[PDB]
Symmetry: D2
Subunit: 512 residues, 4 copies
């Protein structure tokens, strides 16, 4: 039961008034990405506050297409009060760690669909399609022959099923419709027609609204301001008003966490005019780039690639895409070239649209398998990791060879390990697989593992060590630091000297 539209006007309520419409056992879908991107914060806050006061509502199911928050107490962490949530399906878990703490402790039912697939299943749910068929996730923990995307012991119901079409294997992911949506826009009119002029991006706001709407649910939308009916440009409207049931106006709405005023460069309206192991990894990663290539750099040790490219003078000769929608731009990013909706961005990725992608790793095993969704006893989830490493033409894994307070220095054109890491990242067998070396080889993909001391390539007989850093001993610093035996390439070479010098490399971008 939703509040009625008096004279066609969308009901405007306080966030407190709005969350009173959430019943027990509602399935709530939360729009947003990291650091407050498109987050309906007042709604999340109101719901957390209501439960802290009344212990209602109870036993909600959460769908969070991507990870909200600050990797601490923001995002949907405030909703991790015991009894409020009973079940969650998220594309990324570590960004709101209070919820993943609940999953770790078997206190909630917990699934992780690949972020891209997840938003695709919400779009299917909008259309009352029962699920989607995709080979994204075959051979990983989301494959039912492994964990079926289940994150803990208490999670039992099979959502993902193995199916066959054209004599090929695919996964079938069940499409689940939400009952409630917390979405957000910059501005809407008196009938709820909404524009995103100052938002960092779009994500899958329309998809979420349609899925909840067509499930007889309540769409609640936070906006910064409301305007007169039919005065927005029709080509700027991203959500038709009839999809929205309740509007909350937050005149203090901020583009990102931190309360900074609207930045119109971030909005897209104006054109804006240190050698460590992380720069080293980003540098060697750039060597994998080609002229005209479409790539994706992931958060982590490689996210410096764009900067290195700018330093090297080749940043305009390829294009980097962001999983959530933005295309191009410089360090939120500014001077973007385009912004797609998140679902469409993932459709592109799934079909092998990326020439090169760069992903972090927590662990690598003898098979070339990579883990990121669980490590160190913690649940992190995938984000778009599976969507990106499943079919991209070249997969470039980036990270240090060891972990746990590793300290290095790059001086005199060499790598100095001043304090070796406590933890081996190169292990015999992954407890759980996020990326399958076997499937990537079956798909004909080119797989690299770039570290600060060593570079490997995946082959049919495992990892071949192809490059070794200056200042590093093969036996003591590499072979003694891995819990498996890599093939040593007969072509083994020192890593390019330029990488280790604190000056522009004179790198010239190859054209294939």
């Amino acid at each position: 039961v939703k509040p009625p539209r008096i004279n066609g006007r969308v009901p405007v309520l306080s966030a407190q008034e709005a969350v009173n419409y959430i019943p027990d056992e509602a399935t709530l879908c939360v729009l947003g990405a990291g650091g407050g991107i498109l987050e309906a914060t007042t709604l999340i806050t109101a719901l957390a506050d209501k439960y802290k006061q009344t212990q209602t509502p109870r036993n909600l199911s959460i769908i969070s297409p991507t990870g909200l928050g600050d990797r601490a107490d923001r995002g949907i962490s405030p909703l991790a009060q015991e009894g409020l949530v009973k079940w969650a399906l998220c594309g990324h878990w570590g960004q709101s760690p209070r919820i993943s703490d609940l999953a770790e402790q078997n206190k909630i039912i917990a699934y992780n669909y690949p972020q891209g697939v997840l938003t695709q299943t919400l779009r299917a749910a909008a259309a009352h399609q029962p699920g989607i068929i995709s080979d994204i996730g075959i051979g990983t923990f989301v494959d039912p022959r492994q964990q079926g995307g289940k994150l803990n012991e208490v999670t039992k119901e099979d959502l993902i099923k193995l199916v066959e079409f054209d004599n090929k294997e695919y996964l079938y992911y069940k499409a689940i419709a939400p009952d409630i949506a917390f979405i957000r826009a910059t501005t809407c009119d008196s009938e709820g027609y909404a524009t995103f002029e100052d938002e960092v991006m779009y994500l899958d706001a329309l998809v979420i609204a349609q899925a909840v709407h067509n499930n007889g649910g309540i769409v609640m939308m936070q906006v910064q301001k409301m305007v007169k009916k039919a005065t927005l440009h029709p080509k700027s409207v991203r959500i038709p008003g009839y999809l929205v049931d309740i509007v909350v106006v937050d005149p203090d709405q901020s583009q990102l966490y931190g309360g900074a005023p609207v930045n119109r460069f971030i909005s897209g309206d104006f054109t804006l005019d240190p050698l460590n192991q992380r720069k080293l990894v980003a540098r060697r990663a750039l060597f994998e780039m080609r002229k005209g290539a479409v790539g994706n750099v992931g958060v982590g040790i490689a996210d410096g690639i764009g900067l290195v490219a700018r330093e090297e003078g080749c940043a305009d000769d390829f294009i980097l895409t962001v999983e959530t929608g933005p295309i191009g731009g410089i360090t939120a990013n500014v001077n973007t070239r385009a912004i797609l909706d998140m679902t469409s961005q993932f459709d592109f990725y799934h079909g092998g649209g990326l020439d090169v992608c760069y992903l972090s790793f927590a662990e690598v095993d003898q098979h070339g398998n990579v883990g990121v969704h669980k490590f160190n006893g913690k649940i992190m989830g995938t984000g778009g990791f599976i969507d990106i490493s499943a079919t991209s033409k070249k997969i470039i894994f980036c990270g240090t060879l060891t972990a746990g307070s590793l300290k290095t220095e790059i001086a005199d054109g060499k790598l100095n390990i001043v304090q070796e890491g406590r933890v081996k990242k190169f292990i015999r067998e992954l407890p759980e697989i996020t990326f399958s070396g076997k499937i990537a080889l079956e798909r004909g993909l080119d797989v690299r593992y770039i570290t600060e001391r060593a570079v490997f390539t995946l082959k049919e007989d495992g990892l071949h060590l192809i490059e070794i850093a200056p200042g590093v001993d093969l036996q003591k610093d590499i072979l003694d630091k891995m819990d498996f035996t890599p093939v040593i390439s007969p072509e083994l070479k020192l890593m390019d000297e330029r990488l280790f010098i604190d000056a522009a490399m004179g790198f010239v971008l190859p054209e294939a």
Copy 2:
């Protein structure tokens, strides 16, 4: 083989040069809707001319998400030269009759997926998904238990398969990826980043470009003009440049057929300041609307409802959507409220988003089945007919009770049949089903049949005659004009007197 990007710029070619890249047996996807909407005319023309002069390329497959053309010699009719096209899959067939003539004559393999499903399968193909699961089309000619969407005898290969998920029936539609795209935008930059500021709508341009791009195909895009790199607004860009392989610049590009100059009302930039049998049907159809309902712009006798609502002064109390993406507006419409891409519009329709849908009929049978895709020996195809009649809450069929130049006069608050139609439309059994009466009843839907002389409702025991026009004889003008016997409602009443008076009805729209 595609032309190389020189200096990072998208290759710019004449239409003639561009079409020389199309090999024998390629699968060509053509963007566009009726009357020139988003049609890359210079590319269709050049391809037609090349075959006329050289009889190359040969044996192409065509995918046409919706119907292009003018119901005569434009659209893809120029491509109906014998030997050029071997195979076609279209969401609508009558808009380019030369192509549908080849289908009727068994000269080409010919399939009709529901337009909405068709564009969704292209989106699936972009993602390398093998097909989609949907209950849209169950119980109709697209059902493999009937014709499986095959339009003639020569068409043999099954593309649609019956599947089961959670003890429910669904159709599995195979996703086919094209090899070549003819797309279009208003403007692009030197790297192919494209905006649609002057286009009537967006259709599924991005979906088509992604589908062809991720199938290693060639995307060819017609634009009116090109601008300096990175000078377009990132939030206005609908097609990222890396999806585009060839740009054709047509300075004389027209929004619609007819050569008229750009109309900035049609672009969305500015706000614009007879009682016959068709108006009669549109008026009675308006009675089915209520405040706050979402309905669709109908094609045919139903298209006059908006104008009637305006006359009665209730046009702002509800919203009509257009299958191809536009939402709201007045008579290409102007003063629209929003424009979605076409695929997302059908996602909405499939999930039962329409409270009311208005559709024409060619034939109705004793089971309440409706036929429009084939009649009078001709292939028309569906357009969005199945996508809209499958799950919409109220299904309102509109048309005259007989066909073949029926003439009536509305005089003295009565209907006078002055020249009875030659052809009976209410027949015993449909040779081919576009809409299933049984399925609609299973789905809980409210089904009306509105004619100029009589109104019916579908019930479990068949059609109930509920209303009769003043001036008409039940026996001679209705019963004798149907090949089956409807149930006569015991509450049988005259159609509202005001419908038949040539003044404003003073109609008041029912509450929300």
Copy 3:
């Protein structure tokens, strides 16, 4: 000396650095209007700071086209440090009372050209025209046969001359070019090309820049942000970059005083969806309006006219203009219809553009002269008072009959004077004239004086009392509160009954 433009880039400096370029005895022109409108606050602050610390620069002349500030210590009040300013020409004086205090104490030379004329003379100085010829001010204190616009005893040099053209009297006003400008915009590119997208209005920013530029001076411009060269829309650029010598960037720049975040209704980008003595005068003033008439938004007791017209439902039937350039709109207005530069607005006023003009009064004498520029021993200055009262078709003076905490109660459809004002406003002879009753009659102008208790009209033989408020004694409340005897109209009536009733009047605006 101005800083060099490195590679064509406009020098960017801190406000502190920028103000170091100001030498002793510079003529400084300061952009802005009341309450922070278009005020380069960092530049005023930095200059005031500089003088407080160093007692340099010295003996500056100020030109301030209109009044800046908050009628207290903001605006150019910080510049009222003795020794800093020696001379000032301002269009309004009471908005920055520390400066007018200096003028009252004969501490500076002090002139008041009418605001419209003053901005016209700056435009003249841009063109190196020696002065302007206008009949605006004839018969007032700005007329050299009176005070010549000199505000104190220390002010001696004649700036204004009586001249003769076409057998008519005119004033010649000397055009004085400034040496330094403090201007402001929202955004500029790297070459100084500036846009005003978020500013409340434009004022005379371009005029100031040209005047200073063509006088070999230094133009200093505060902006909120800077963008890449040539990325701003050429038709939004109000100031060509070659006019700008130094830019100061203030990322925290606020539309008005108060530090509120940018309001996009105020920017012009979006459409926004008690009966006391002041409302009473506003109501009676509205009676003077007619459909299609062009009026001014008044400053003072007149400012309520728009809200009364909205209450009465006739706000859209006429247009009110703002002296500083905005046209139309609702309560910084929002939903304006147009924004002109300030000088053009006054061009319009000077030629008799206003059908109706609403103005406050401090004093009225027996000749119907009005005084606002001096009273109660203080200098207020004119603002646009003379520009608007000189030639508007109807001149409607609005104010209470007495001053000095007059308190009234409007109960039972009558006026009750509960506390009489201590000061008589209707005196025998104005010591200094702001509006000439004689010149108004010569010009054929219709002149009204509306009070809470009485309404007068100026005639050839003096003020005629035409209306008396119910509840008021003619002798004690009116005649005894004036130092002259008005003619009592034979047609003297009570003020319209509805004015004194606390409900909507049912007022019908007179026809065009």
Copy 4:
């Protein structure tokens, strides 16, 4: 005689009905520049048709701030029917030669104010100022000591007189207000509020509208389209609707003559991606430019300077402005940097804003006087020649040394005169002066004369020949071709060799 605004709507009429409001002896002001720029063509056409058919209205006065037309039968040429025009005042005369033919034959009273001054006097008229005081035109034919702006014998009444202020000489130009205006915009709302989004520029449309409006006249505005009230952006509106009395809608309205469709590069909305005597002169003219200079390249042999600059790679190091408003841009122009209204542009010029101006000459005399307004027994008028040559810092006159079928050829680094001109352009004494060498030297300006064969500089003792083309004889090709003897510089040198070589000069623009 003006049509009433029904319900606040501006009267919309055909051009034929519109011109019916023009009475005998009205003063008509016509907006527009060369080649159809901002020309209300339908209104000129309809007035011209009315007179051709009815011989009314009669004896109109024409004010044309600048020259309209194609130097033939367009512009205001259609208005040159005998008895229609009695009196004309234009800033330029050669652009509509049929009207100047009338002046030449003493058929009409004919004046030429300098273009800039003329538009300034219309602005002064809007404010009911009687005239403007300006030193622009001192010592030229507009000086009453010479011709007083009068173009023929029948022109008697004095409009321009000599005055004195600050013991300096000035011209006083009488301000004449028109009774009728033909203005134009792109779009207006239903109340006349007008925007110029697709117009080439703004010229002085607002000034003309205010001038006529405040003279109780009729303002007629041609637009391409009309829109709903209050839907245009207020910051885009250039003309407030209450200034407009009749609107004429021409849906076929073209940006320029020739009926080409709207060009959005010309509108300002998008960023666009042979050695003869003319190029030679343009090249030598470029030598006079420096980095950071503000220039104005004029009509004729100079107009090639921008292209030469682009060719030499220094086009972005200085800025050229156009007298009618546009600033910057490339070959109407595109990629402009800003567009001022015309009057404001001339304010800037009048105050010495131009560092360099480039002007054409018809005749030069021994004193360095230049003639362009009259030559070869024809009236050309000034355009903005006087406004620009009066106070600009450097005045570069550009032309050939002789006229009338002069053919030259440049190769082997020399000038070859193949056919000498019939007409000597360097004469003893100008019959009428357009530019005064004496006045320029008084004002301390640097005056150059560039021809294909010789370069001169004006000094106190006349023209110094400072440069001579290679391949040319001093006595035969220069001295024998002049009617006075120039001073031969002792530093006389060959014109730069690179000027006469068909390759890039490697020219470096001197520093700021």
